[PDB]
């Protein structure tokens, strides 16, 4: 009968309708973010939209530090993002306890994707409503950006976009990557990649940013942290005076 | 509420039969045909595998006949995937019987164990019934040769000649005329081959899509020899039956 | 119906070379074209 579209069951076209509708829930916040991969570090920059003046800007953020070495940026409704953050932190804890060494980004991304797949396969569960971008630097592999989805399809990215204008930023970065033929930014300093990402994001969205519209996460060698507002203002001032 | 998505598998119809086993008995008819003939000297199990092509592997490939014990072999007609679990449980039960009594398990005990397994799902649990029906063949000192059959309903009866699967009625009508009470193994084998030739949906009868299992008792007494006819020996009986 | 298509295509092929009679090798061309179309449209 018509109960196909309600639960995660196959459809006459061979489609999982619930998982398809889950993706449309990731654009509710219409927050555009992108992450580039530097020569030795990674930086992820996301729009920071504060709807009401009653909000405290410090607490509102879609960037969660999973561990001392792995950072994560998540797009979608925040409560499900926080559930995913809790599970990811707990699983990083469990892996560090059981194996004794800090886990690489790909392992965490694969485990969260497997969890989302278990969510999809079990009928009584509903799929996660978020899209998670795992970002970190792996001394065993190198800088890496990993993006999963509600279905569980994860794959490393040279540079990740998201939000309503994900396609436009994707082409904007693809033109640069296809003209420079390099798989990563050649800028050695984490200082330069931040301005590169901000400049490309500004040219893509066509908007000008202030101290509070954007939140930048930086993952250096064995260190992840979120820059404060003064840091973003200084970066924007440097960009404005440079170009 | 987890109710609207329930299908109520174990529900009595207004007139009073189950509906899931009703459609399982239709799924049986859409599977490959199998034939079982009870002869005085032995039992012959043959089946025609469905979906055959030049790229089908035949060197080591048995999908309709399965071995549960050195004396007892079964024929599968239906969904092979669901039949695999039943086969494994039957083998486990037979080995447990050998554990408990240190004597060959009679066919009726295993047939009951499998019928009970099917009935348990047809009764409670709200799960779909197994869409597979078996053909049981074996030997013992109790009743000699035995030839039962199974159903998704979980009922079993003894038969001197059965054929479950596609064109069951045609095969039964063909075999009932030619069935006597005194054939040897070869007469039953040629009768089964003729029945398969006259019931198949293709034109000719090539050795690729036919499987044979026979029970023979010769010089050695008390132990029968179970041989699954390989293609090299399978193509031999085709010329003997005249089909070639 | 493919046989009729083969015959009609052979007749057309004879016209393409501005000839007056249908030949066996034009029949080969027609049957090849008909087979190709039949096996392609099955996709």
């Amino acid at each position: 009968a018509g109960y196909d579209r309600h639960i995660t069951i196959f459809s006459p076209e061979g489609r999982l309708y619930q998982v398809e509708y889950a993706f449309k829930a990731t654009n509710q916040t219409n927050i555009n973010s992108l992450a580039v991969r530097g020569k030795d570090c990674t930086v992820v920059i996301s729009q920071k939209k504060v709807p009401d003046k009653l909000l405290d800007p410090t607490t509102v953020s879609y960037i969660f530090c999973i561990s001392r070495t792995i950072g994560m940026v998540v797009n979608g409704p925040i409560p499900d993002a926080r559930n995913a953050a809790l599970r990811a932190k707990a699983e990083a804890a469990e892996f560090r306890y059981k194996y004794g060494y800090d886990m690489p980004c790909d392992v965490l991304a694969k485990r969260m994707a497997n969890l989302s797949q278990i969510y999809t396969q079990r009928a009584y569960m509903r799929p996660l409503g978020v899209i998670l971008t795992f970002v970190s630097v792996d001394e065993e592999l190198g800088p890496s950006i990993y993006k999963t989805d509600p279905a569980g399809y994860y794959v490393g990215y040279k540079a990740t976009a998201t939000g309503p204008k994900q396609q436009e930023i994707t082409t904007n970065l693809e033109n640069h990557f296809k003209k420079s033929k390099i798989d990563h930014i050649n800028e050695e300093s984490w200082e330069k990649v931040v301005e590169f990402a901000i400049t490309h994001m500004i040219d893509a969205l066509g908007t000008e940013f202030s101290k509070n519209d954007l939140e930048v996460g930086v993952a250096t060698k064995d260190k992840f942290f979120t820059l404060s507002a003064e840091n973003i203002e200084e970066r924007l001032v440097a960009i404005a005076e440079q170009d | 509420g987890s109710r609207r998505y329930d299908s109520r598998t174990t529900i009595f119809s207004p007139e009073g039969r189950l509906y899931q086993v009703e459609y399982a008995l239709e799924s049986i008819s859409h599977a490959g045909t199998a034939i079982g003939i009870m002869a005085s000297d032995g039992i012959v199990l043959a089946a025609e595998r469905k979906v055959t092509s030049t790229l089908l592997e035949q060197d080591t490939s048995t999908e309709k006949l399965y071995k549960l014990n050195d004396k007892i072999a079964v024929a599968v007609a239906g969904l092979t995937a669901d039949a695999e679990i039943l086969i494994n449980t039957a083998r486990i039960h037979a080995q447990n019987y050998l554990k408990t009594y240190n004597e060959d398990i009679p066919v009726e005990i295993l047939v009951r164990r499998l019928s009970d397994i099917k009935q348990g799902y047809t009764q409670h649990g709200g799960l779909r019934p197994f869409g597979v029906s078996f053909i049981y063949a074996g030997y013992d000192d109790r009743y000699g040769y035995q030839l039962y059959t199974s159903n998704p309903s979980g009922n079993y009866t003894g038969w001197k000649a059965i054929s479950v699967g596609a064109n069951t009625s045609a095969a039964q009508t063909l075999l009932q005329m030619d069935y006597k009470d005194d054939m040897k193994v070869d007469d039953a084998i040629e009768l089964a081959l003729k029945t398969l030739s006259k019931t198949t949906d293709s034109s000719a009868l090539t050795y690729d899509r036919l499987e044979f299992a026979t029970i023979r008792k010769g010089a050695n007494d008390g132990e029968v020899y179970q041989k699954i006819f390989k293609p090299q020996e399978i193509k031999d009986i085709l010329v003997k039956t005249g089909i070639t | 119906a493919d046989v009729k298509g083969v015959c009609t295509e052979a007749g057309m092929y004879a016209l393409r070379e501005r000839r007056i009679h249908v030949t066996q090798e034009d029949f080969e061309l027609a049957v090849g074209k008909v087979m190709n179309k039949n096996q392609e449209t099955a996709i």
């Binding site: - | 109710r3 329930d6 109520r8 174990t10 529900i11 009595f12 119809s13 207004p14 007139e15 009073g16 039969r17 009870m38 009726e108 019928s115 009970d116 009935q119 047809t122 009764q123 409670h124 649990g125 709200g126 009743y143 035995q146 039962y148 159903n151 309903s153 979980g154 009922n155 079993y156 009866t157 003894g158 038969w159 001197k160 000649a161 059965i162 039964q172 009932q176 069935y179 | -």
Partner: protein, 241 residues
């Protein structure tokens, strides 16, 4: 696992599953039983749709629960032998717990109880079988015949039949059997049971099976060569009178 209730009280008061199981029983093979002074006879028929069913390994329609009490069923054959297994294991447990061979009344009560529980427990459809229990209590020669319905109601019957066309056999027993004057011999009981069967079976002497139960741990199964012997004089006495 499955906790959903399958038997729900209908707005008219009946349970739909139980009253559907009644019809499921109504499609089963006819089974009849009568009792004499010291003999009880359970007669039954078999399906004649398909042939080439042997007799030796074919499961008997009347299953032996114990040496002194036997059971016959009608309706869905798949579910009935489960009740047979439960009754047998319960009889063995009763022997272990009370040091006494089981009685017909207690076994029938247990069967009615398990059918009632399946009509009560969630996630399980009611049994589609109707059972007849016959036998003799220890040190007692009185034949006891009991009928158990899928609804869980059990009663004693001097002569009861179940299955398809059970109304015809019931009305036949209502006039050719006397409750206050039972037949006095095993032969008379067998003759009455046979003559009752031809009212419905209408040929099929091959697939008419009859079990005769006697006291002092005596249960016999009459073969075909005796059933046709009775049928001979029964049909001889039918048309000439």
């Amino acid at each position: 696992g499955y906790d959903r209730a399958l038997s729900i009280f209908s707005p008219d008061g009946h349970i739909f599953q139980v009253e559907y199981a009644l019809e499921a029983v109504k499609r089963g093979t006819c089974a009849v039983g009568v009792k004499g002074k010291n003999c009880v006879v359970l007669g039954c028929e078999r399906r004649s749709t398909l042939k080439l069913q042997d007799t030796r390994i074919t499961p008997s329609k009347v299953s032996k629960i114990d040496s002194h009490v036997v059971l016959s069923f009608s309706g869905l054959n798949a579910d009935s032998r489960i009740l047979i297994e439960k009754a047998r294991v319960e009889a063995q447990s009763h022997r272990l717990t009370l040091e006494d061979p089981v009685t017909v009344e207690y076994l029938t009560r247990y069967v009615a109880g398990v059918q009632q529980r399946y009509t009560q427990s969630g996630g399980v459809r009611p049994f589609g079988v109707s059972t007849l229990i016959a036998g003799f209590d220890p040190r007692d020669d009185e034949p006891k015949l009991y009928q158990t319905e899928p609804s869980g109601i059990y009663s004693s019957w001097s002569a009861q039949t179940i299955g398809r066309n059970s109304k015809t056999v019931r009305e036949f027993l209502e006039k050719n059997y006397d409750r206050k004057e039972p037949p006095a011999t095993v032969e008379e009981c067998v003759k009455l049971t046979v003559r009752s069967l031809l009212e419905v079976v209408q040929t099929g002497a091959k697939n008419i099976e009859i079990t005769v139960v006697k006291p002092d741990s005596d249960i016999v199964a009459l073969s075909s060569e005796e059933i046709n012997q009775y049928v001979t004089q029964i049909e001889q006495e039918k048309q000439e009178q």
